Amino acid sequence: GSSGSSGHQQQRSVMTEEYKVPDGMVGFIIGRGGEQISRIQQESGCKIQIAPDSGGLPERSCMLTGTPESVQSAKRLLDQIVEKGRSGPSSG
User: Fold this and answer.
1) How far apart are CA 81 and CA 5, in angstroms?
2) Distance between CA 83 and CA 77 in Å, rounded?
3) Which of 17, 41, 43, 53 has minimal CB crowding within 10 Å?
4) DSSP 21-36
5) What is the largest CA-CA distance in the chain?
6) Start and end of every KH domain?
């Protein structure tokens, strides 16, 4: 009983991206203790800095930090949450 390992993994250079999300979802994006978002941060391995108080805007800005491939991956997750929590295809 054995298993391989392999490698092929590295990073370099970090960029900042500005992504807006629906405050009506962000609140749910965080999760219970910020685990819902953590999974997204760990899933895409990207950083997501969400403001404590959106203030009075409809969308809450989220400061992303990390690779570009990670920023997008994370975004997909975010948008997903919103999408998954946007509306159903006519209550069957």
Assistant:
1) 33
2) 10
3) 53
4) EEHHHHHHHH-SSSHH
5) 58
6) 14-78
Asked if 29 contacts 37 with a C-beta cutoff of 8 angstroms, the reply is yes
Locate 71 and state its tokens.
């920023």
User: CA nearest 73: which of 31, 50, 52, 42?
Assistant: 42
Confirm if 46 and 64 have CB atoms less than 8 A apart: yes
Sheet with 15-22, strands from edge to edge, namely 15-22, 59-66, 47-50
Architecture of domain 1-92: 2-Layer Sandwich (3.30)
Please, which residues have CB within 8 angstroms of residue 64's CB and are 6 or more apart in sequence? Answer: 16, 17, 18, 19, 46, 47, 48, 49, 71, 74, 75
